[PDB]
């Protein structure tokens, strides 16, 4: 099989895993076994991984035309969704952990989950606005438009890495923090390689698809799977 076909096979394996983890996490949440904020963010992350695998299949099937651009856009948006859900968890866990350090005697702050969610949702909205702007100018159909979208993803990956770093510095024994940090490192590395690949040749579809699969693999293996495994024990 060609490279793009191998990438779709891998993404479909990840989507299969994601559907199964969604079922396990839902039962765990109904049984009082997982925190609601973490559950809701992992659920969003898994749904982005399912969408990524769908867009990748469409990209393989539509190398040209409007369906090609729509598959590329859907694929990039699902990558943004995975990073924003990672950012949401790291930010929320950090804010809660910081309050414990600065003032352990204070009551639960209701603003913290709302603050983490609002910040992560802003990135999703900003990306949708950027896509619309490039689509209106026509720049979306040129290589410079795709670079601008990948540069946005790289900046989001850097912000996600910073959030994961701050969270991991609070508790070095926190395994979820360690998984978010390593995933954020791999995701940033994958996007920096994709930006390099897009300058070296015209294989733009392969560059983005490769980054997309690496991003979903990192999230599944390093962030989601260990939480699910702990619930199984
Ligand atoms: Cl206090
Ligand atoms: K407190
Ligand atoms: K959301
Ligand atoms: K940690």
Numbering used by the authors: 0 to 232
What does the paper say about this structure?
Here we use a robust deep learning pipeline to design complex folds and soluble analogues of integral membrane proteins. Unique membrane topologies, such as those from G-protein-coupled receptors, are not found in the soluble proteome, and we demonstrate that their structural features can be recapitulated in solution. Biophysical analyses demonstrate the high thermal stability of the designs, and experimental structures show remarkable design accuracy. The soluble analogues were functionalized with native structural motifs, as a proof of concept for bringing membrane protein functions to the soluble proteome, potentially enabling new approaches in drug discovery.
Then, we tested our design approach in one of the most prevalent membrane folds in nature: the GPCR fold. The core topology of GPCRs comprises seven transmembrane helices that facilitate numerous non-local interactions, enabling them to bind to a variety of ligands, including photoreceptors, odours, pheromones, hormones and neurotransmitters. De novo design of GPCR-like folds (GLFs) offers the potential to create new small-molecule receptors and protein scaffolds with functional sites of GPCRs. We tested 56 designs, of which 36 were expressed to be soluble, and we selected the ten most highly expressed designs for further biochemical characterization. Of these ten designs, nine were monodisperse monomers in solution, and all showed the characteristic circular dichroism signature of α-helix-rich proteins. All ten designs also showed high thermal stabilities (Tm > 90 °C). Last, the designed GLFs preserved the canonical seven-helical bundle characteristic of native GPCRs. Structurally, the crystal structures were in very good agreement with the design models, with r.m.s.d.Cα values of 1.05 Å and 0.88 Å for GLF_18 and GLF_32, respectively. This accuracy further extended to the side-chain level, for which comparisons of crystal structures versus design models for GLF_18 and GLF_32 showed 1.54 and 1.40 Å r.m.s.d.fa values, respectively. Comparing the structures of the soluble analogues with that of the reference native GPCR, the overall backbone r.m.s.d.Cα values were 3.08 and 3.51 Å for GLF_18 and GLF_32, respectively.
